[PDB]
Amino acid sequence: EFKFLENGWVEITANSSRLVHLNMPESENYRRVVVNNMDKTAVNGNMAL
Amino acid sequence: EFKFLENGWVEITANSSRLVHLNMPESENYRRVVVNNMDKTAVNGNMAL
Amino acid sequence: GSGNGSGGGGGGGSGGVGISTGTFNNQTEFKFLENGWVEITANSSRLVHLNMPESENYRRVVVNNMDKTAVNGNMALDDIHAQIVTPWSLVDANAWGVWFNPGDWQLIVNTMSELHLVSFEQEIFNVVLKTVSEPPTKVYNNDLTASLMVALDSNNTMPFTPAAMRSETLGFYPWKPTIPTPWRYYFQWDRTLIPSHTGTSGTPTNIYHGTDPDDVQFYTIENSVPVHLLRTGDEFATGTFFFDCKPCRLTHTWQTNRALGLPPFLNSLPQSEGATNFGDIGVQQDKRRGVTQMGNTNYITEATIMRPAEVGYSAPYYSFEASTQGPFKTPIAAGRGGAQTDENQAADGNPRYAFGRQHGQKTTTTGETPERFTYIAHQDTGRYPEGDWIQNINFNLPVTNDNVLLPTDPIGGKTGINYTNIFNTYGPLTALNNVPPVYPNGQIWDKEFDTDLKPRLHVNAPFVCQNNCPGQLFVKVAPNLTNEYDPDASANMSRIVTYSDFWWKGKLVFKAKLRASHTWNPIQQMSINVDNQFNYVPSNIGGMKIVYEKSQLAPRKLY
DNA sequence: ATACCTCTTGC
DNA sequence: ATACCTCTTGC
DNA sequence: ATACCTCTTGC
DNA sequence: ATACCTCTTGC
Ligand SMILES: [Mg+2]
Ligand SMILES: [Mg+2]
Ligand SMILES: [Mg+2]
Ligand SMILES: [Mg+2]
């Protein structure tokens, strides 16, 4: 919705809806994980990676 | 000027000015003239002209 | 061989043919208030002269000194750019000299401590228009009914072009006439240009691409302002405008990082006069108590010791950067100054003004070379690169060559370069001041940029208006036609030769504050003497000139 | 529409 | 009779 | 609880 | 009986 006001102001109202789908989690736990692509960086010149 | 109102109406005001120049007429008379390009139409197939 | 007829004057309450519509005043008022505030009111008037434009058209011109840059090593010389050219002329008055004479300046500067800009308004009157008609006997007649046009861009729709940046404001002498300048403005354009040197092989790309249609903007007075037409009897006047902007100080600071805080206690004092009897701290540099920002040593020296933050900063020079439209020098705030300069050491940061007779150059002096100078602020906030240096963290000293970079060692293998040229130390701890005014050739106030984020200051003027700035004032002679005119024709129209004169008067108001003695010793003060004495007076011919003067004379603690 | 070198013999 | 590129620092 | 391609034949 | 280098964060 665009609603024009005095003096050229507009009030834009945007609505939006969705059907959302969701599965049960893999596991009901909180986990603390470490990620390690050492190998890739191990390369030399692959710092950015 | 554009002046925005409620409900998306606008009032457009346009001003305009000019410097106008004007010479005296060729003659202070009213004339009744006839124009005749007979010759051109005389052609045959030149009706439109 | 006629006088035109002399035409006869009708009379209203604010004007007519033989009725003056204004009053000349170029006088300056100081009005002392309670608590040492002063209200300075400065009036100023001029007789302005103006001719009809070259042509009643707006033009879009491109300028191209390709040849000069074509040179290789002449990057800096690039003048390329586009611009719209109008038939209008601009009346700019933004410049110290328009408003004050020296005497004034003196006062201000010696007795005050800070200055605020307050309001400003102007007006035009006693308008006159004449026509020239011509054996070359030129004759001049008033054209009673012709008009002068005037437009005031209060909305600030036009792009802003302060004219002092080119020394085109009005004159600085009340007793001598002057004129407005022809208005023009930048027009967008794309452009490329690869830097090079003497030694540089071939032809570095160097071209004018054209115009980003996106970036296009073309304005016209006519379509954006209302134009007033004045006849002799008419007169025009702007309202009064009020400024919203910080104050400007008239004092300078002098402490540098070195002078902040409690100096070290000297365990040992001199016992007789003489400039060689120093005092002594009397403690091993590596044994003193105190604080530093250096985690490795135990050294504590006036240069090591910690300071609360940092005055001044260092930046690259001479730096040219480049964007869409070509290169340009990177500006600095600071400048330099001091003992190790003397206008010859004169570097980056100090500004330099150049100008004509209307603005200070000796009136009688012949020859079209501009007069000049380099303003050297009193505020000791700049840098002395030569003194800089950098060293390895290990900080083992005395230091080894391998562990230190000097202003002497050459960078990029170029001899005449060193880190200080590309160095930069600005940062959250930096602290500094605004430029100081420059009499008489300095701009006074300036518009702020419409960017989302903003400069903390401008270098061209001390007063930057926060909100809107007073709209520009344009004028122009109204076209006076002959009896022949054919707009349908391609040729340029012929006009009667016409021109105009009118007086302009303005009022600019500041508000300031008296200063007061705080130290035992007296301080610096501007003053006249045998040496400069003649700068302030006309020559036996009427030679006049206005020399530049300083502004922040007195000192102030910084901390 | 003149007041002691400004505004201001005002207010 | 100048307000942030219009009217419109209005109303 | 439908009004002239929105909000909104509302207020 | 501390206010932004005076009087004076007074009045
Ligand atoms: Mg307006
Ligand atoms: Mg506006
Ligand atoms: Mg584009
Ligand atoms: Mg672009």
mmCIF file of C-alpha atoms (C1' of nucleotides) in Angstrom, chain C residues 120 122 154-155 238 242 468 471, chain E residues 1-7 9:
data_model
loop_
_atom_site.group_PDB
_atom_site.id
_atom_site.type_symbol
_atom_site.label_atom_id
_atom_site.label_comp_id
_atom_site.label_asym_id
_atom_site.label_seq_id
_atom_site.Cartn_x
_atom_site.Cartn_y
_atom_site.Cartn_z
ATOM 1 C CA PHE C 120 23.350 39.190 6.764
ATOM 2 C CA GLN C 122 21.633 43.086 1.175
ATOM 3 C CA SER C 154 16.792 31.563 -1.973
ATOM 4 C CA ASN C 155 16.029 28.001 -2.329
ATOM 5 C CA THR C 238 16.537 40.699 0.485
ATOM 6 C CA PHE C 242 20.526 34.273 10.025
ATOM 7 C CA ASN C 468 20.981 26.356 4.456
ATOM 8 C CA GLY C 471 21.064 32.077 -1.641
ATOM 9 C "C1'" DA E 1 11.117 40.004 3.115
ATOM 10 C "C1'" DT E 2 16.848 34.309 1.526
ATOM 11 C "C1'" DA E 3 15.922 28.639 4.733
ATOM 12 C "C1'" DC E 4 18.414 22.878 3.302
ATOM 13 C "C1'" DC E 5 16.829 21.711 -5.582
ATOM 14 C "C1'" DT E 6 9.127 23.720 -6.155
ATOM 15 C "C1'" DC E 7 4.773 25.622 -4.261
ATOM 16 C "C1'" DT E 9 10.773 27.866 7.136
#
